[PDB]
Amino acid sequence: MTELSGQPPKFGGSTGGLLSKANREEKYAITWTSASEQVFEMPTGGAAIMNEGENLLYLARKEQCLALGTQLRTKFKPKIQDYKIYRVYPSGEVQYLHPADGVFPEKVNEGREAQGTKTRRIGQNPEPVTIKFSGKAPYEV
Amino acid sequence: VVVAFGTPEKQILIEPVFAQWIQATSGKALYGFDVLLSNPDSIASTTGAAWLPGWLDAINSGTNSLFLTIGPG
Amino acid sequence: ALNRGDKVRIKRTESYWYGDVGTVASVEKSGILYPVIVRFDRVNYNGFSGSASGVNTNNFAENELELVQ
Amino acid sequence: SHSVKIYDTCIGCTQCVRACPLDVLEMVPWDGCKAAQIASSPRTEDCVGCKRCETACPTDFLSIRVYLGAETTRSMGLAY
Amino acid sequence: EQWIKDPLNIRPIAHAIWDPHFGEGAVNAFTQAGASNPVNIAYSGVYHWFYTIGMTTNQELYSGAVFLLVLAS
Amino acid sequence: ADDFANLTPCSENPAYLAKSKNFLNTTNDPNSGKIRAERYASALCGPEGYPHLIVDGRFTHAGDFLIPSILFLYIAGWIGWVGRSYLIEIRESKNPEMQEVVINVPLAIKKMLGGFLWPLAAVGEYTSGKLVMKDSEIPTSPR
Amino acid sequence: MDGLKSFLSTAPVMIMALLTFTAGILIEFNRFYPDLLFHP
Amino acid sequence: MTISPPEREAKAKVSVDNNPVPTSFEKWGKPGHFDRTLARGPKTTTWIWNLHANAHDFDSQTSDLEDVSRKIFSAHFGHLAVVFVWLSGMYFHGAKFSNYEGWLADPTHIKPSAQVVWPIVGQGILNGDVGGGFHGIQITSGLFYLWRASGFTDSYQLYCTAIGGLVMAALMLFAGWFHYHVKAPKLEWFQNVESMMNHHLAGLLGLGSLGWAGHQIHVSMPINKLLDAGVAPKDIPLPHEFILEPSKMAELYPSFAQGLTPFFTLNWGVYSDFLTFKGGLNPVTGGLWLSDTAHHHLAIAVLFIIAGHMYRTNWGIGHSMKEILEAHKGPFTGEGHKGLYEILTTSWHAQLAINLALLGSLTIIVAQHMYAMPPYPYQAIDYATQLSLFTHHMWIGGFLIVGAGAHGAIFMVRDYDPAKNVNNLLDRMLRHRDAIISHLNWVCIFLGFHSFGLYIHNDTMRALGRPQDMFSDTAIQLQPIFAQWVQHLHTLAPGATAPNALATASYAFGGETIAVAGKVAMMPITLGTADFMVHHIHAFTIHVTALILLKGVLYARSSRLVPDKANLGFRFPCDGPGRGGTCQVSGWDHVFLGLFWMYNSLSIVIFHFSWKMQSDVWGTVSPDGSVTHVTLGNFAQSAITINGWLRDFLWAQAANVINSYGSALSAYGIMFLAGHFVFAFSLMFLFSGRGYWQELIESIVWAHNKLNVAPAIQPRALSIIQGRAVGVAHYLLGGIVTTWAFFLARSLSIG
Ligand code: CLA
Ligand code: CLA
Ligand code: CLA
Ligand code: CLA
Ligand code: CLA
Ligand code: CLA
Ligand code: CLA
Ligand SMILES: CCCCCCCCCCCCCCCC(=O)OC[C@H](COP(=O)(O)OC[C@@H](O)CO)OC(=O)CCCCCCCCCCCCCCC
Ligand SMILES: CC1=C(/C=C/C(C)=C/C=C/C(C)=C\C=C\C=C(C)\C=C\C=C(C)\C=C\C2=C[C@@H](C)[C@H](O)CC2(C)C)C(C)(C)C[C@@H](O)C1
Numbered sequence A: 001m002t003e004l005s006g007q008p009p010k011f012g013g014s015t016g017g018l019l020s021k022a023n024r025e026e027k028y029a030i031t032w033t034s035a036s037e038q039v040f041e042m043p044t045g046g047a048a049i050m051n052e053g054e055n056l057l058y059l060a061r062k063e064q065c066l067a068l069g070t071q072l073r074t075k076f077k078p079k080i081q082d083y084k085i086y087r088v089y090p091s092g093e094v095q096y097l098h099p100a101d102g103v104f105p106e107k108v109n110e111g112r113e114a115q116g117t118k119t120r121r122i123g124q125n126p127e128p129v130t131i132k133f134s135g136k137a138p139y140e141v
Numbered sequence B: 001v002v003v004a005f006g007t008p009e010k011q012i013l014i015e016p017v018f019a020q021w022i023q024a025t026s027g028k029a030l031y032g033f034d035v036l037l038s039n040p041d042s043i044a045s046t047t048g049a050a051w052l053p054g055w056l057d058a059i060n061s062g063t064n065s066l067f068l069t070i071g072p073g
Numbered sequence C: 001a002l003n004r005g006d007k008v009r010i011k012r013t014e015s016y017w018y019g020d021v022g023t024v025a026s027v028e029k030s031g032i033l034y035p036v037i038v039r040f041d042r043v044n045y046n047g048f049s050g051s052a053s054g055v056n057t058n059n060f061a062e063n064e065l066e067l068v069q
Numbered sequence D: 001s002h003s004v005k006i007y008d009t010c011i012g013c014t015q016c017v018r019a020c021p022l023d024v025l026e027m028v029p030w031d032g033c034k035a036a037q038i039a040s041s042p043r044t045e046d047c048v049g050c051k052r053c054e055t056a057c058p059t060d061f062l063s064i065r066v067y068l069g070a071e072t073t074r075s076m077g078l079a080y
Numbered sequence E: 001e002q003w004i005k006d007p008l009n010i011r012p013i014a015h016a017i018w019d020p021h022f023g024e025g026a027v028n029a030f031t032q033a034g035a036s037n038p039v040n041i042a043y044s045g046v047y048h049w050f051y052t053i054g055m056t057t058n059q060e061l062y063s064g065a066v067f068l069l070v071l072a073s
Numbered sequence F: 001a002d003d004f005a006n007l008t009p010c011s012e013n014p015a016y017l018a019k020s021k022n023f024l025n026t027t028n029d030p031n032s033g034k035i036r037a038e039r040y041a042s043a044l045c046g047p048e049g050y051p052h053l054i055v056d057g058r059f060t061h062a063g064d065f066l067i068p069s070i071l072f073l074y075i076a077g078w079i080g081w082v083g084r085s086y087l088i089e090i091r092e093s094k095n096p097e098m099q100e101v102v103i104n105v106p107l108a109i110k111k112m113l114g115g116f117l118w119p120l121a122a123v124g125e126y127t128s129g130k131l132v133m134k135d136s137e138i139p140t141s142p143r
Numbered sequence G: 001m002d003g004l005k006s007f008l009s010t011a012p013v014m015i016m017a018l019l020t021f022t023a024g025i026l027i028e029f030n031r032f033y034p035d036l037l038f039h040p
Numbered sequence H: 001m002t003i004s005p006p007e008r009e010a011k012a013k014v015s016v017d018n019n020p021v022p023t024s025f026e027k028w029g030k031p032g033h034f035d036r037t038l039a040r041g042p043k044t045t046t047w048i049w050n051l052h053a054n055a056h057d058f059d060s061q062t063s064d065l066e067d068v069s070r071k072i073f074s075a076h077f078g079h080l081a082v083v084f085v086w087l088s089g090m091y092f093h094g095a096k097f098s099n100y101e102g103w104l105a106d107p108t109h110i111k112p113s114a115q116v117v118w119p120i121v122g123q124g125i126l127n128g129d130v131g132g133g134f135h136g137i138q139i140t141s142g143l144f145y146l147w148r149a150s151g152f153t154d155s156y157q158l159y160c161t162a163i164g165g166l167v168m169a170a171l172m173l174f175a176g177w178f179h180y181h182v183k184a185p186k187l188e189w190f191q192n193v194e195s196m197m198n199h200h201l202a203g204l205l206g207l208g209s210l211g212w213a214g215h216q217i218h219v220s221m222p223i224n225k226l227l228d229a230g231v232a233p234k235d236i237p238l239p240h241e242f243i244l245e246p247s248k249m250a251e252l253y254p255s256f257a258q259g260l261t262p263f264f265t266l267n268w269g270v271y272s273d274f275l276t277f278k279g280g281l282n283p284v285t286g287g288l289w290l291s292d293t294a295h296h297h298l299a300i301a302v303l304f305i306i307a308g309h310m311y312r313t314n315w316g317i318g319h320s321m322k323e324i325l326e327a328h329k330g331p332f333t334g335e336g337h338k339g340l341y342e343i344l345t346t347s348w349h350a351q352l353a354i355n356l357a358l359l360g361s362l363t364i365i366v367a368q369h370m371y372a373m374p375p376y377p378y379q380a381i382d383y384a385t386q387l388s389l390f391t392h393h394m395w396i397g398g399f400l401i402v403g404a405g406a407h408g409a410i411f412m413v414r415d416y417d418p419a420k421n422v423n424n425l426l427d428r429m430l431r432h433r434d435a436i437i438s439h440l441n442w443v444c445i446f447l448g449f450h451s452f453g454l455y456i457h458n459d460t461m462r463a464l465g466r467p468q469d470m471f472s473d474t475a476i477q478l479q480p481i482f483a484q485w486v487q488h489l490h491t492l493a494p495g496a497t498a499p500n501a502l503a504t505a506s507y508a509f510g511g512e513t514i515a516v517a518g519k520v521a522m523m524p525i526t527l528g529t530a531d532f533m534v535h536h537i538h539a540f541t542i543h544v545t546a547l548i549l550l551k552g553v554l555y556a557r558s559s560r561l562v563p564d565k566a567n568l569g570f571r572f573p574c575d576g577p578g579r580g581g582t583c584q585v586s587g588w589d590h591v592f593l594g595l596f597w598m599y600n601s602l603s604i605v606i607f608h609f610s611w612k613m614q615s616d617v618w619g620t621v622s623p624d625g626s627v628t629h630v631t632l633g634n635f636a637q638s639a640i641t642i643n644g645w646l647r648d649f650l651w652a653q654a655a656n657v658i659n660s661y662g663s664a665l666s667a668y669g670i671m672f673l674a675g676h677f678v679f680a681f682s683l684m685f686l687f688s689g690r691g692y693w694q695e696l697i698e699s700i701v702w703a704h705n706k707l708n709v710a711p712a713i714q715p716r717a718l719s720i721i722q723g724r725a726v727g728v729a730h731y732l733l734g735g736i737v738t739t740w741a742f743f744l745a746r747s748l749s750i751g
């Protein structure tokens, strides 16, 4: 969020990358360190080469960044788990996104507040007729 | 298949006896059931109703669509 | 009140096995909402499209099991 | 944005979060199950509604539920 | 009014055709039912209905149409 | 009396007679058409000359539906009963799905050969409580 | 061996054997007694 | 341990493993043994379907490339044995259930038949009277014409051929068993692509056509020379008599008096009486001159044998295909063909995609070349055989092409390694897939508007009483002037740019009207406005099919919508109702849609063929010289509107199909209705989804549990993918069977 660093992956270009949304609306960044210069698959099509050391790459969506991240941590002989994903606005604001609290979300970490939790079963949702003409749905109450 | 092979006589042609009997209950004498209105000796016909002659004349004439004759088709 | 080997009928309504019968595998300790583990001969619908079978075990609470045996 | 709810039948197997391709969900401490953990959905603004989480759920009918809602650029999965 | 004179041999008319795409063949083909301009033949059974009702002139139909204008208002 | 007046016996119907003098040979027997004509001349024909089957239940036309109905029902109840019986017998064999996919030929033949008594078997299972199950013991979906 | 008997008792082989037997039954019956629209 | 032969290698690159898989029957009784997700047994009915779905998916069974290769090799042997059984069955029915000799004695007054139907339940009527007291089903496969061109004259030769075919099937089956179980060749052996190409060029295709040139010269040509001269088939010597008595050849071909010396001294012209370049057709039979086809096979053999020497094997001479490929790179295409040799020598699916594409295209080329240059005696006059062969080869080609799309997609998902494709042709294709597909999309839109839209314009103009505003030969003309120009070039060629040819390569391009008996075999096929419009329909439908399948391959790994599609596989239903809905993104679903579009394309191609040949080519010719066509030249004025195709083609020509009851064609009406029913039936599977059916099954399972009759193998609704597969299979089956019954009734009822 200070200033993103890292070399761009060695890549000859493609038609599958950023469009107008990137400058008008929002784009996404993913950084990661690699112990070696090596080939990886671009989520936007084709092969690219990551540099030895730090790497910084811009993509159009959060999902493309997370797909690249899964590829990094599950498809290289020594894993790459230090990748960071940010949201970037045209104003220049950079919003750190992933991993949210410095710990991957699959494993418990202290300090997280439950969101969207219900203290009931799915079968214990109320009848819709009981909540009609309100703004809610049985899972929102 | 039975008509294709040149034996149209081997079809399963079920006569619609139920609806024909029903038509006969309203005066239709074509099928020869003679039930209720189709039977002059019946009490439903011996009522003196002002509509029975016209209804019978309209239903026993094969010139309208009133209770059209029916077959296996 | 349940023990391993008990035949129970499911009463959760929304569960795949409501009205069907399973067998108790283990009973978890107190403080847990759904401690009774039940196994079933008939798998449920669980699985991505085209998967061969499904899940045949689920956790319940005692009020949701009816002892048959 | 879509809605994602987590009910108390959660066994905390973490497959919810492992399946999410957009990091909507988290494992947070809890006490209802043996694993002492439950799934949470703090980032539903990035949810697209692919339903992978529920496809991963083992409990008899899901402990995680995704109800598709107001469509945005993010929820429609748009790269443009 | 014409179709009243001979309702078994005259084809009742729905409305007039006005289509600049037409050529000579279609103009001649749709100038039918005794009309001088292209026309469509009505199959809504509306002539028989209005005639059995008791209407016999274009004046009565026009008055009914204007009255329904007022009713809609 | 004058019932079924719309129809006439095929031996009376002249269109049937004309067409039956031309009944084709369905097999190798050069008399198959002639046997067909003789056989169908007993039913009731229509104005076109084809036989019409009366299935309102009168026994004079019992051969038009009642007898084949009885025959089919015996055979179909047989098939269903022996199949259900084999299906029940598999359940006590630890892995019933395999014998549903890989048939136990000796057991299945034993079950098939004993199907001629399926009406009495079904009556006994009805009285004994084996045939039908209770509602409260059958899985159902939310209402 | 037991494998060949098990393969010969699989659902597709068994159903095609039953179907072939029933086909033969019906074919031969209609060869020796054809054109039975009803029961005389 | 089974049979143990010596060894059988002679300083060869042959390498095998002895007895890797013992022969055994146990797994025959263990269905699903090959899939770990299936071996335990079923629990739901889905288990059954997948057992058939994955039976040949050798990749998904083992990760070992060598074992996959071995399975494929033995499967190929088994498939060849199946084809041998089928072909020997054809020859056996020709020997024992055909009127072949009777047809041979008089092929202008008898219809070929080679299937006799047993008399049962009235179906004996299908044994139509085909001439000479023979009663059976009229065949349209052209078997009689092939057998006459080959020089068959007797039932016993066909019977001997059927026995040889059965022995060949047994040999292929034993070879498959032997090379899977006894001596399984190593992966190193399969990857010898240079040697395999040398052998398939010089040995399979070269020696094949060489031996066939031998048979044509020694058996086909003298026997047909005598057959067309009016000699009765019984008076003609047996094939081996021309080889025992060379004077027979020498009097049929004086060059034989000189023997083989002119061959070895490059004095080939002496052979000009039996190695010919006549062109045109045989006036007696309407087919290509057998001498022309023998000279053709000789030259093709020389060509292929020469070709079989390009690649290096054990002797330093020859080419490395890897080197050639690596040398072809340019300023526009990065590293070029680097990596292609490794792809096509480690990926079975890549090879299969190439080979399916080319083999389908070839089958189509075969249909197109055989209709206009009829190679067999009396095939062109048999309009039913002509139509049937054209359409059959069309459909086979289309299916093979769609399969090529399927296996390009499977390669992309399963075998593509991005570390082995850095800045090569495949990589750059992936890197501008968007440009490729957006442009193909636009070309399809343009081609549809300016082909089908022209038909809609014409329909609307004709309905409006405005014939002068139509696209037609008599109004606003769309002349295909380039095709006309090339036809003229072909017609002038025998006298200029093909001097040593006497006639045209095909009379469709122009020239005389070759007629045998009273019917035309071939005549100039003129091209006008309706032909222009339908050719652009063809270009449009082909482009749309290509769009679908090419998009399927290029986006199988990822898209902007789904950037991890590769992890989802080649075959999968979607990725959920999210992202607006992602149904049918898989490569499999692109194949599923391309099937429908290929069916569309080919239906139009074959309808075009049928109508144009019936209207402007086929017909009967008077002794005065004039020609009268089957549908009286109606194509030019009627094929330019959709109403014209609906009325003058479909409606008019369907009269034979729908009136076939009461005759030997009745089965064609039966199967016409059958195809219609199957087409309608497919719409249930295509227009719905499995959730509804799973709930309906829930209710029915309740019914079964009520009487204690529910199965242990729980019924499940079909999967999403399987719903689509069933729907498309039934759609294609029903539509194709409909067109088949229609075509056969028509072409058999038109003289
Ligand atoms: C699905 C409804 C249906 C029904 C109602 C029928 C009915 C009939 N069809 Mg048809 N058919 C159908 C569909 C149907 N078909 C379809 C879809 C097709 C297209 C393929 C055909 C095409 C077709 C043809 C071409 C022909 C028929 C024929 C017949 C008749 C022959 C009956 C017979 O064989 O005698 C009775 C047969 C038996 C009794 C033998 C059955 C085997 C039993 C089980 C033997 C075992 C005996 C067992 C011990 C029971 C004995 C009694 C026991 C209690 C002691 C019959 C009325 C034939 C005919 O003659 O038409 C009039 C005929 O040629 N059908
Ligand atoms: C009686 C001789 C025999 C015996 C007992 C075996 C034994 C075995 N084979 Mg082998 N094999 C044989 C002949 C035989 N094979 C032949 C002739 C071929 C050449 C096609 C092969 C090629 C071969 C391959 C490539 C593979 C095996 C495999 C196997 C094992 C599993 C078989 C299975 O899945 O169930 C039995 C399955 C069937 C009987 C299939 C049903 C028949 C199909 C559906 C249609 C018939 C096609 C047929 C092959 C050719 C047509 C005959 C023609 C007259 C029309 C098994 C131990 C598999 C293996 O190793 O498992 C890991 C393996 O992948 N075999
Ligand atoms: C290759 C394709 C092919 C095709 C499609 C046909 C088609 C046909 N042939 Mg022909 N034939 C062929 C090849 C073929 N043949 C070959 C290669 C030969 C040389 C051996 C012959 C020799 C031949 C003769 C001599 C005759 C025919 C006849 C016929 C017709 C009658 C078919 C019939 O009633 O079968 C009969 C049906 C059976 C014998 C029962 C089949 C039993 C099945 C398989 C039961 C399946 C279940 C069982 C468990 C088997 C499973 C295997 C197990 C190991 C799991 C028919 C249209 C007849 C004909 O032309 O009529 C005038 C006739 O007489 N064929
Ligand atoms: C001149 C040598 C030669 C010939 C004739 C063939 C021919 C063939 N190969 Mg083979 N191949 C060869 C060398 C050869 N190969 C070598 C050296 C290698 C190692 C690199 C391979 C490795 C290879 C593989 C991996 C595969 C093939 C396959 C095939 C078959 C598929 C094409 C087809 O079906 O066509 C038409 C089919 C026919 C004409 C049927 C006839 C087949 C018989 C057995 C050939 C008999 C000819 C023989 C030389 C005797 C002639 C002498 C005399 C009678 C005149 C085909 C029959 C594929 C196959 O189908 O596997 C079985 C397969 O997958 N080849
Ligand atoms: C595979 C296909 C095939 C088969 C097996 C045959 C088989 C046969 N042919 Mg045939 N033929 C074929 C293709 C084939 N031919 C083709 C493509 C042509 C067109 C060119 C011909 C045209 C043809 C003619 C005109 C004749 C035959 C003849 C024969 C028969 C005797 C020839 C022989 O083999 O003696 C053995 C051959 C030799 C011993 C050759 C030695 C003679 C020369 C001098 C040796 C030179 C070889 C040397 C390496 C080259 C250097 C020469 C240079 C230094 C000057 C024989 C059964 C003859 C026959 O019997 O008629 C019925 C005959 O007259 N054929
Ligand atoms: C030499 C050609 C060739 C080769 C060997 C392969 C090989 C393979 N293909 Mg491919 N493909 C081909 C051509 C070929 N294909 C063609 C022509 C098409 C276009 C239709 C496709 C489209 C295609 C798709 C979409 C898929 C494959 C798949 C597969 C793999 C699994 C095979 C299978 O499905 O098992 C078993 C086969 C069956 C269960 C077929 C039964 C259903 C058929 C279609 C019924 C046909 C009806 C019959 C012809 C006429 C009606 C008769 C009826 C009335 C009784 C296998 C490795 C699958 C895969 O996952 O690849 C890894 C798959 O997804 N192929
Ligand atoms: C007759 C039915 C029909 C029609 C009209 C279409 C239409 C189209 N399909 Mg489609 N398709 C169909 C059936 C049909 N499909 C079915 C059953 C399937 C299931 C397999 C598919 C699956 C399918 C796929 C997978 C694809 C298509 C594609 C296309 C487009 C091809 C490009 C094109 O033709 O541009 C031009 C448009 C036309 C020729 C349509 C007719 C336009 C008329 C003649 C002029 C319009 C007059 C005017 C605008 C009227 C305005 C009125 C006013 C009041 C506003 C096209 C718009 C391909 C595509 O999108 O290519 C880019 C594509 O990939 N189809
Ligand atoms: C009826 C036909 C007459 C009408 C004329 C229509 C003109 C069509 C355009 C000309 C073809 C352009 C391709 C060659 C031009 C060509 O190959 O140049 C060569 C260039 C690559 O050359 P390299 O020097 O890199 O060669 C190295 C090789 O070894 C490969 O590594 O190709 C490209 O740049 C790729 C771009 C292709 C994208 C253009 C394709 C557009 C699709 C439409 C083409 C329609 C053709 C229909 C005919 C059947
Ligand atoms: C025993 C058996 C089973 C099950 C059997 C069960 C449980 C059956 C249950 C049946 C029920 C619950 C109800 C059945 C009702 C039947 C009715 C209402 C029949 C009505 C028929 C009429 C009115 C027929 C009339 C006509 C009479 C002949 C009266 C004329 O000419 C024609 C015609 C059509 C008028 C299985 C399934 C377990 C196994 C099978 O093999 C058989």
Ligand SMILES: CC1=C(/C=C/C(C)=C\C=C\C(C)=C/C=C/C=C(C)/C=C/C=C(C)/C=C/C2=C(C)C(=O)CCC2(C)C)C(C)(C)CCC1
Binding pocket: E060, E061, E063, E064, E065, E067, E068
């Ligand atoms: C003071 C009064 C009385 C005197 C009443 C007098 C003096 C006149 C009464 C007239 C009345 C009471 C009703 C008249 C109704 C007419 C109606 C309602 C017309 C309805 C038409 C409709 C609805 C639409 C018709 C359509 C049109 C227009 C068409 O043209 C085509 C057909 C159709 C589409 C149907 C008496 C002393 C008796 C009783 C005491 C009160």
Ligand SMILES: CC1=C(C/C=C(\C)CCC[C@H](C)CCC[C@H](C)CCCC(C)C)C(=O)c2ccccc2C1=O
Binding pocket: G015, H684, H685, H686, H688, H689, H690, H693, H716, H717, H718, H719, H720, H722, H723, H724
């Ligand atoms: C009807 C239907 C079903 C129900 C269809 C089912 C359950 C299949 C029933 C098949 C029966 C059990 C087999 C009958 C066909 C046999 C394969 C033929 C074998 C014949 C031999 C015995 C000779 C789906 O599951 C489905 C799923 C997705 C989209 C559409 C649909 C759909 O339309």
Ligand code: SF4
Binding pocket: D009, D010, D011, D012, D013, D014, D015, D016, D017, D038, D039, D053, D056, D057, D058, D059, D062, D063, D064
């Ligand atoms: S959402 Fe369900 S499957 Fe996922 S971790 Fe929670 S309880 Fe387990």
Ligand code: SF4
Binding pocket: H573, H574, H575, H576, H577, H578, H581, H582, H583, H584, H689, H720
């Ligand atoms: S409708 Fe079916 S295929 Fe489409 S997204 Fe939903 S589940 Fe998937």
Ligand SMILES: [Cl-]
Binding pocket: H462, H638, H641, H643, H644
């Ligand atoms: Cl028209």
